[PDB]
């Protein structure tokens with residue numbers, strides 16, 4: 581009969597109550613700036629869909645970041661632009677400051693506020709228990725905001741969380757995979773980085789929602805408090821689900837696919853095995869025990885669940901006792 585449908589348990593119908601133009605990004609008209617306002621300083625990184633540069637606004641000597649988009653699809657470029665404009669001003673959302681036409685690539689170049697980011701490989705080795713809770717709360721503010729605005733990020737990972745640790749500033753970046761949530765819509769499962777893909781993606785269940793980001797966030801939390809980055813270190817997309825199953829167990833995985841009438845890829849028949857769920861104390865050792873608390877493990881347990889409908893929402897996560905000790909603004 582096919583898979584059972586699913587829908588978000590929060591912010592379900594936010595987009596159908598909005599003007600069509602809010603989410604119909606294919607009809608958006610880009611307002612262009614002057615590309616010669618910015619001088620490229622150095623390349624910061626390259627990805628599948630863009631190259632990113634540190635730059636200077638030569639009109640005021642202000643440092644910015646320029647993201648030159650690769651030619652991809654008028655849809656995906658307009659999608660990222662529309663989402664960045666819809667979310668601009670939200671808590672810990674990276675601010676899109678300008679859009680110009682790059683003369684070399686002949687594609688849009690997005691100009692962002694500059695964040696003096698600490699490399700996450702280096703930064704995660706120094707985070708205290710309080711820092712992890714503090715920055716997790718800051719990420720949750722960004723996630724609840726974009727979810728409340730009908731948008732899922734779909735690429736939550738350490739690389740996409742810029743942190744100025746000297747000034748304790750955090751920004752959620754790279755909205756190139758973000759998408760508007762429409763109930764009943766089937767989405768491409770080829771999103772997120774492998775280590776942060778939710779089980780819904782790994783079992784090819786397309787009717788997912790905001791809760792995908794909360795799984796990715798749980799993967800980040802596990803890597804931080806246990807000091808193992810990434811936590812689920814699969815060699816490919818299939819081994820990725822096996823890695824998750826060796827921790828969460830196979831019985832809850834089969835209950836998950838049974839509930840949604842999902843059929844597993846038969847390739848898993850010879851590699852999945854039979855695994856009990858593990859208690860989190862197995863991953864606690866003398867080198868990370870100062871980052872682990874009963875509150876942290878309860879919170880992690882409520883994020884890392886196979887059933888996307890059972891995971892904490894971002895708002896619910898901010899209510900968790902794990903954050904009782906964090907001073908809020």
Ligand SMILES: Cc1ccc(N/C=C2\C(=O)CCc3c2oc2c(Cl)c(Cl)c(O)cc32)cc1
Pocket residue numbers: 624625626627628629630632645647674692693694695696697742753754755756
């Ligand atoms: C490989 C690859 C693909 C896509 C992306 N997209 C990056 C960014 C944005 O989408 C938001 C702005 C922003 C981006 O990267 C930044 C970095 Cl690295 C620093 Cl340091 C910063 O201050 C700001 C940003 C980056 C890298």
